[PDB]
Design a protein around this ligand. Structure first.
Ligand SMILES: Nc1nc2c(ncn2[C@@H]2O[C@H](COP(=O)(O)OP(=O)(O)NP(=O)(O)O)[C@@H](O)[C@H]2O)c(=O)[nH]1
Ligand SMILES: *[C@H](Cc1nnco1)n1cnc(-c2cc(C(F)(F)F)cc(C(F)(F)F)c2)n1
Ligand SMILES: [Cl-]
Ligand SMILES: [Cl-]
Ligand SMILES: [Cl-]
Ligand SMILES: [Cl-]
Ligand SMILES: [Cl-]
Ligand SMILES: [Mg+2]
Lengths: 1017, 123, 208
């Protein structure tokens, strides 16, 4: 359409057309908006587009057009400024300056085009970064002078100074070289005396204007870096803490300044300064109390009403109070005349802590943690805060979030259901709350018990009964486990359990019973110490959990299983010994009834149960008794297994049955579960099934392949084939789980490994890509990790079977076969670590693929792959270095040294692998240092490419200068030479080396970078 | 809201997909409660399904007598079928739907209820 | 009445995937980088009536940045996105925020840490504090699992309508039509169906 006209620069720019396109973009919709957007981006991106900026700024009636004009200028100034002829630089400065002067002098424009003015200011600041002070020394004096001539200009100057301070001190680290950042910071520092004088004057001669707010906003920025004397040796604290707190327009910004003041670096041995620090706080709290709200005010209600800027004000008050007090509350704790200030400040925080807003609560909870941690250690302090801490106990107890363990929740219909998913974002919160409450319990264990026990009584009587109340209380009670004496715990837990049992009887119906069930389970699981001392009650608890495993409420059932294993993890010794007055260790009783106990559970719940039994069985250290227990535990699955193995072996037909495939999968999963908790002790059970299991692995593998043959790749999606592959995966998982914990590695090598490799390697190698299980690679990693050193031919066999075929799956893009990709590089890593010889035996073609594979890895953005990619490369270089002066080492360097240098530089400089900067730098440093230390014996150059006897240092620099020259043709030769000189010198100091690399990354983004920047020290 | 005049014959949690024939892929359309609603005035039974949290309608169509539930090759807990007139997004529109459930039992119960609803609508 | 919402954040953080989930219900697994900006209207039904967001989903890759802060002009709200499995994306939050509030000085903004479904989380909960001094709302979210996916829009709606008790409500469900299939199309439906039957549904290991 017509809109594309602006893209023809052979003609003159039709400004009317430009404004129509911009307006179509900002105010339009649909296809028209989209077309307009593409046009504007192409316009913006035209490298002569800047030449139209003045024309646009002059003629346009659309402020967005002018904004876009300024974006075009910014891009030019930030990237190509020093390319420009000098007169174009003067011209650009002049019309940016003129436009700002112009817009500030027209009151209407100043009032209503603030976006455009702000943008113009930033653009100016970009010019200052380039030109100031060296080629603009009069900028600050003249800004200061102009400020007196006009209120609007003075105000806008404050915006400019704010932006300059941000760009120089807050955002310079990633955007400028170290030298340039130092230059500009020093320049700002040198002229700040006068900047501050203006700031202070403005603040004295005004009340709550926009000029005042602008000035204070700039002050917030200055406070990040200015010396403390500007704050403590002028009257400015009094102004901030009194005058500017009174008007709401200035209050928001002032409070943020005062928070930053509270972070200033300040002498610690000076009583005057201390008094000043006390006074501004006193003033500030006084203004809040008399101009905003008193200490008794309901801040929970105020925040909830959400009027005007109240939420942000309350947030900022929380930030101010917590920042100041964490730093300075000791200033207030010894002088009696300051006690009321200390406590009122804390009472405000107590009120702030009642607000319903999670993120704000976290901010306040962080402070409370800081406080109670100090009161726990520091002599003679806790009595000061006894009343505050007492209110804090109530707040925490009443705002306890649901622990991970509690799996029931209330739905929108008021029904208590099992949770759909984990509440992952409240895990940290629960921990934080618990930490504070534990400290608070230690600080006054009598107060805590009293509060909990009477809150509990008001649940039983009915007065305060609700799901929310019984819950938070129950969670709070569980969370303080460990803080009381055994004796007090005993009486406490006894009272709590009685009361919760009473509630269970009294509160009828499915929802009530679920709630109370969940609560008692949580509590009892939290107090193993009590359980250990009270066998009869432990026994009763476990038996009740077994009853709950038959519950139709699925939340309760699931939690019964988690609670069983949680208790068992802590109390297992009491299950393995024979208790007084019992005829058998309780583990025997559990195993005998396992079929009945677990009959209504889902499979994964059964596996959890079996895992728990394994925990107990592994407490038995007499091997005969342990193996016997293991044997008894595995009786059901072993009988199921035996019958299945007899069928299977007679004819591979029956295994097609999906009911049989599920049965098999659950047998192996049960074995995995028990192996997980028994580890090394699981071996006899593994031995009972091992040979038949690997035969099954083969039979199922044949079926999978047959099905893919008869049905196509789509077969891999079917329930049957997924079921068959689940068997393979669980088998692999079982062997991995066992080998990862094995203590007899001789048996692993002699009994387990050869049949494993025989069953899995060729099957992997000879299936089509979509039928290969990444879990094979995962199993092999653990095999190599644990016994690789004992099986060098085995490791060779692993590489042969998986290396090339897996590489060919993952080397066409970065996304297909994501699991294979991740497990592939983990395997190569451990092989490179533990069995480097395996790579030495590779044929040269295959070793070349290995090097390619590693470089491919570090071009991933996927962190799993990239990180291993970089580690492998590092480890490989070390492995080669370790061989010393031998033909393989020399050929490695001749073939691959520069490939590693160039590939590492590539990911360092492309902007798409910033996550790996640290490890890229480490590898590069290693590589450069190899030459710098003459650790490469042969010349890296060939024949008469360069004079005979030329050192590898000289050739390396030559190579790099040439590489960088061609790759970054906008750099000067001097920038390149200076960069490499610096980098090569610094190849033994990683921090400095990395700074030089970062400086280089800044300079490649622009033209004209100063080569002396690389001298920074 | 427009559901007070209806009886809930069946409710189950489900994930609804729609087939993009161009991309040749299934695309999720919503997860939540799929309900079979019978209008008390017309006795006509519809499927109405809404997304969790946003409560937006991801299915709204009569359970036509002519529809047939078909298995998907990938799943033993889903049904696929062709719908000629769904108004979840407003204007009546044809779709091939797949609906998946938490279990095979659930999928089988759905089919049974779906076919019952079809006979009600036939009346 | 409708509100302009700008969505910003590093490339690959899940901005477009988040929006798509809200537009169609789908989860897009492919990463196709946004070019400049894509604008999508998005409506929610609430107890205070319908609220419409004009979502300006911007490009996070520098190479595809387009008009950059030019997109933010006249935004009435924003979401800043990072990826909890990539620390560099959290480190860049202050850069996005800076560029945003320079153009939009007083607007409600939600910070979102995406991809919490992924097991190996890199940006710890405890580390996420940038929002406090800047008065941003913060949520852990997952476009993939839908964890908290509605929260950012529910908060912004409350702040923009100025009513803290605003809730999403069930949109009215009109009686659906009775249509008989076209005799002429029944041969084609048979075909279109069979392709759909023989394309596997994604994520068959998910709970639903
Ligand atoms: N695991 C997981 N992956 C996600 C989630 N959200 C998005 N992704 C994935 O992350 C990748 C990038 O998503 P995309 O929406 O394009 O990110 P973007 O921020 O829009 N990128 P750009 O700024 O370049 O347009 C996609 O593969 C997508 O499927 C999530 O919650 N969990
Ligand atoms: C209330 C919860 C409930 N749900 N269904 C039936 O009851 N209730 C009643 N008794 C218990 C309970 C009792 C014990 C006992 F008796 F051993 F102390 C223990 C538990 C628990 F959870 F196993 F520890 C619960 N709960
Ligand atoms: Cl503008
Ligand atoms: Cl001074
Ligand atoms: Cl023990
Ligand atoms: Cl030069
Ligand atoms: Cl990371
Ligand atoms: Mg995108």
């Amino acid at each position: 359409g017509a809109m594309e006209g602006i893209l023809d620069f052979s003609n003159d720019l039709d400004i009317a057309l430009l404004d129509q396109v911009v307006s179509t973009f900002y105010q339009g919709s649909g296809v028209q908006q989209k077309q307009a957007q593409e046009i504007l981006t192409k316009f913006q991106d035209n490298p002569d587009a800047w030449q139209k900026a003045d024309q646009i700024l002059q003629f346009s009636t659309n402020p967005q057009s002018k904004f876009i004009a300024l974006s075009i200028l910014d891009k030019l100034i930030t990237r190509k400024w020093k390319l420009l002829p000098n007169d174009h630089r003067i011209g650009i400065r002049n019309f940016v300056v003129g436009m700002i002067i112009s817009m500030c002098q027209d009151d209407e424009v100043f009032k209503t085009q603030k976006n455009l003015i702000n943008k113009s200011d930033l653009t100016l600041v970009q010019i200052l970064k380039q030109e100031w002070p060296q080629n603009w020394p009069e900028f600050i004096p003249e800004l200061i002078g102009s400020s007196s001539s006009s209120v609007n200009v003075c105000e806008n100057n404050m915006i400019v100074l704010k932006l300059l301070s941000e760009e120089v001190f807050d955002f310079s680290a990633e955007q400028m070289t170290q030298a340039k950042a130092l230059h500009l910071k020093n320049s700002m520092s040198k002229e700040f005396e006068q900047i501050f004088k203006l700031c202070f004057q403005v603040l004295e001669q005004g009340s709550s204007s926009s000029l005042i707010v602008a000035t204070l906003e700039s002050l917030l920025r200055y406070l990040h870096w200015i010396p403390y004397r500007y704050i403590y040796e002028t009257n400015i604290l009094e102004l901030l803490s009194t005058k500017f707190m009174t008007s709401p327009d200035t209050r928001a910004i002032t409070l943020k300044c005062l928070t930053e003041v509270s972070n200033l670096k300040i002498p610690q041995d000076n009583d005057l300064i201390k008094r000043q620090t006390v006074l501004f706080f006193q003033n500030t709290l006084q203004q809040i109390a008399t101009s905003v709200m008193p200490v008794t005010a309901d801040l929970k209600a105020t925040y909830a009403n959400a009027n005007g800027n109240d939420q942000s004000f309350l947030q900022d008050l929380a930030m101010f109070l917590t920042t100041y007090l964490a730093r300075n509350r000791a200033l207030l704790e010894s002088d009696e005349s300051l006690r009321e200030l200390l406590l009122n400040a804390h009472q405000y925080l107590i009120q702030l802590s009642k607000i319903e807003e999670r993120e704000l609560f976290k901010t306040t909870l962080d402070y409370w943690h800081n406080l109670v941690a100090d009161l726990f250690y520091e002599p003679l302090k806790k009595h000061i805060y006894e009343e505050i801490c007492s209110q804090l106990r109530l707040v925490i107890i009443e705002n306890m979030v649901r622990p991970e363990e509690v799996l029931v929740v209330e739905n929108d219909e008021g029904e208590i259901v099992r949770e759909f998913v984990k509440e992952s974002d409240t895990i940290q919160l629960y921990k934080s709350e618990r930490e504070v409450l534990v400290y608070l319990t230690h600080l006054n264990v009598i107060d805590t018990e009293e509060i909990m026990i009477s809150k509990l009584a008001r649940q039983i009587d009915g007065s305060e009964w609700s799901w929310h109340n019984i819950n938070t209380l129950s969670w709070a009670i569980g969370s303080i486990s460990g803080t009381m004496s055994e004796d007090t715990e005993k009486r406490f837990v006894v009272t709590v359990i009685k009361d919760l049992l009473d509630l269970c009887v009294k509160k009828r119906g499915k929802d009530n019973k679920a709630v109370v069930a969940s609560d008692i389970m949580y509590v009892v699981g939290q107090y193993p110490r009590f359980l250990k001392a009270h066998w009869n009650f432990l026994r009763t608890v476990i038996l009740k959990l077994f009853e709950f495993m038959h519950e139709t409420h699925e939340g309760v059932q699931d939690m019964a299983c988690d609670t069983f294993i949680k208790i068992v993890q802590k109390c297992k010794y009491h299950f393995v010994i024979q208790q007084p007055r019992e005829s058998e260790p309780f583990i025997q009783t559990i195993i005998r009834d396992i079929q009945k106990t677990t009959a209504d559970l889902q499979p994964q719940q059964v596996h959890t149960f079996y895992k728990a039994c394994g925990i107990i069985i592994s407490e038995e250290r007499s091997v005969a008794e342990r193996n016997r227990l293991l044997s008894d535990l595995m009786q059901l699955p072993n009988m199921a297994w035996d019958t299945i193995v007899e069928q299977s072996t007679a004819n591979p037909t029956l295994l097609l049955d999906s009911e049989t495939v599920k049965i098999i999968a659950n047998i192996i999963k049960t074995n995995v579960a028990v192996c997980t908790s028994m580890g090394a002790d699981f071996y006899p059970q593994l031995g009972h099934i091992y040979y038949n299991m690997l035969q099954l692995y083969r039979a199922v593998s044949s079926m999978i392949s047959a099905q893919v043959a008869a049905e196509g790749l789509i077969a891999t999606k079917t329930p049957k084939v997924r079921g068959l592959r689940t068997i393979k995966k669980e088998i692999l998982k079982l062997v991995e789980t066992y080998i990862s914990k094995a203590r007899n590695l001789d048996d692993v090598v002699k009994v387990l490994v050869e049949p494993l490799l025989n069953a899995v390697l060729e099957d992997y190698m000879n299936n089509v890509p979509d039928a290969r299980d990444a879990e094979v690679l995962n199993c092999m990693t653990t095999v190599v990790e644990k016994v690789g050193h004992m099986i060098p031919q085995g490791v060779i066999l692993i590489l042969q079977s998986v290396f090339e075929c897996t590489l060919d799956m993952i080397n066409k893009d970065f996304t297909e076969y994501p699991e294979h990709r991740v497990e592939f590089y983990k395997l190569l890593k451990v092989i490179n670590e533990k069995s480097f010889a395996a790579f030495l035996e590779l044929p040269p073609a295959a070793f070349k693929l290995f090097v390619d594979a590693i470089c491919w890895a570090f071009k991933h953005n996927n962190r799993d792959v990239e990180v291993n990619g970089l580690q492998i490369a590092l480890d490989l270089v070390k492995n080669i270095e370790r061989m010393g002066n031998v033909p393989f080492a020399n050929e490695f360097h001749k073939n691959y040294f520069f490939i590693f240098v160039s590939e590492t530089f590539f990911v360092l400089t492309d902007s798409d692998h910033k996550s790996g900067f640290s490890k890229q730098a480490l590898l590069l440093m290693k590589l450069i240092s190899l030459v710098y230390d003459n650790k490469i014996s042969v010349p890296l150059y060939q024949e008469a490419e360069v004079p005979q006897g030329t050192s590898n240092q000289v050739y390396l620099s030559q190579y790099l200068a040439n590489m960088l020259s061609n790759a970054f043709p906008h750099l000067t030769s001097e920038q390149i030479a200076s960069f490499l000189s610096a980098l090569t010198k610094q190849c033994k100091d990683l921090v400095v080396f990395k700074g030089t690399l970062r400086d280089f990354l800044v300079q490649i983004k622009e033209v004209g970078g100063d080569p002396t920047d690389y001298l920074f020290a | 809201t427009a559901e007070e005049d209806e009886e809930v014959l069946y409710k189950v949690r489900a994930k609804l997909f729609r087939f993009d024939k161009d991309a040749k892929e299934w695309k999720e359309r919503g997860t939540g409660d799929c309900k079979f609603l019978k209008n008390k005035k017309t006795n006509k039974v519809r499927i109405l399904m809404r997304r969790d949290k946003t409560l937006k309608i991801c299915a709204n169509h009569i359970i036509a007598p002519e529809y047939t539930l078909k298995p998907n090759v990938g799943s033993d807990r889903s049904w696929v079928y062709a719908c000629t007139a769904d108004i979840a997004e407003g204007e009546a529109e044809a779709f091939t739907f797949a609906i998946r459930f938490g279990s095979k039992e659930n999928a089988d119960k759905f089919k049974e209820e779906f076919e019952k609803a079809q006979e009600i609508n036939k009346k | 009445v409708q509100f302009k919402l700008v969505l910003v954040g590093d490339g690959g953080t899940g901005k477009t995937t988040f929006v798509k989930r809200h537009l169609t219900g789908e989860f897009e697994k492919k990463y196709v980088a946004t070019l400049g900006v894509e604008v999508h209207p998005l409506v929610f039904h609430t107890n205070r009536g319908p609220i419409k967001f004009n979502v300006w989903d911007t490009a996070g890759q520098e190479k595809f940045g387009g008009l950059r802060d030019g997109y933010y002009i006249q935004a009435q709200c924003a979401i800043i996105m990072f990826d909890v499995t990539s620390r560099v994306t959290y480190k860049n939050v202050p850069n996005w925020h800076r560029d945003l509030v320079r153009v939009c000085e007083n607007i409600p903004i939600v910070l979102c840490g995406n991809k919490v479904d992924i097991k190996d989380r890199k940006v710890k909960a405890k580390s996420i504090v940038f929002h406090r001094k800047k008065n941003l709302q913060y949520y852990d979210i997952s476009a993939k699992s839908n964890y908290n996916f509605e929260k950012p829009f529910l908060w912004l709606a409350r702040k923009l309508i100025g009513d803290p008790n605003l809730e999403f409500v069930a949109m009215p469900a009109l009686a659906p039509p009775e249509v008989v299939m076209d005799p002429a199309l029944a041969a084609q439906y048979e075909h279109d169906l069979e392709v759909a039957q023989t394309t596997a549904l994604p994520d068959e290991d998910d709970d639903l």
